[model samples]
Target: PLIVPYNLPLPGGVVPRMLITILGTVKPNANRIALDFQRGNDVAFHFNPRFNENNRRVIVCNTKLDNNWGREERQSVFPFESGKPFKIQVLVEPDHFKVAVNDAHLLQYNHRVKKLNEISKLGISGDIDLTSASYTMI
Candidate 1:
């Protein structure tokens, strides 16, 4: 019932094989949820899981620059359900990121921003209640 965004700082920033975990529940009638790996003003990665937008179930991955969106990489996997809890794990590799939803492999997005260390923040928003989120470097 509370509408708020969550921001988690990645201490020392992200490196290759770093793992980020997001635990939350999808709100009923949820339209979308986004987890962004951000720098100062640019987004390195935008992991957006959209539900019921344009009559489709997909995950759109992209980046942002000065409020401009880049080319979106869409994945056709409906791993998230409304009114249900989810545990999402994102593994940052050298060239790409591997994401798993509810302990299952969902999709992978290549590094669009290039520098992993510049991604110093994690931002969460849109129709969901966040329980816990953290990162582990490995």
Candidate 2:
């Protein structure tokens, strides 16, 4: 595995989708999809890997289905083979997901599925161990 820095500053009620085809095989559970990211100073993102109609799609909050409680979400996005150092910080607000990567790029995802009150834990899976994770909720 390699080192990299990817950040995600997501506001509450929003979701952020990342491309993770390197770490490991991406698959879907009984209901929601799991981004099998290889862990190790790893960073992770929460979103279903479903393709929408018109060929346009993005990972968003998956309501009506249980996510197995995503207690924690963190995994490296870049391929470890690159040996690139990156950092990802995901700042969650009250109604959206604000994200920042390498303190460079920025974006947001809408977490409007299911009531905002029912969301307790986030499910994160990978073969790597993470270094540090911090968040603020407002």
Candidate 3:
């Protein structure tokens, strides 16, 4: 399984609304949570305060479609906070997504789509406040 758009960077205090078209593999069984912000030093993802724990819930502005790649698009996770600043980095490898906040702390996911060659497109959507952001080709 694999996801693409190899080396992409996201800056802080930004929300990236994403729409990923998955073809290679079926979606993963895990909960496909949405990311809100990413920079070189911090990261943020939204969690439901009513359903999820308090700490899990965060203020959200956009989404980064994870390994749950699909055409079924949705709004970004709603925020628990008004607004806070942070940084993030996205490291897309052949089969794994190494996501880090502050380029240090992080969360990772494996590509669930079965055919590694099937998945390639990565859609990113969000607001603008990023210090810097860019994607690299394989």
Order the numbered candidates by lDDT, best leading: 1, 2, 3
lDDT of 3 at 70: 29
Best by TM-score: 1
Clashes of each: 0, 53, 16
Q: What 10-residue stretch in candidate 2 is worst by lDDT?
A: 34-43
Task: Please list the Cα RMSD from the true structure of every candidate, rounded to 1 decimal place.
Answer: 1.9, 11.3, 14.3
- lDDT for every model? 0.86, 0.35, 0.32
Output the lDDT of residue 54, model 3: 43
- Give candidate 2's error at residue 111 in angstroms: 1.7
Residues 1-138 of candidate 1: C-alpha lDDT, one tens digit per residue: 233488888866788878988888988889999888998889989999888668888889999988899999987778899999989999988889899999999998898888777889988899888888888877
Error of 2 at 52 (Å): 19
- Which 10 residues in a row give candidate 3 its minimum summed lDDT? 18-27
On the 0 to 100 scale, the lDDT of residue 74 in model 1 is 86
lDDT, candidate 3, at 57: 34
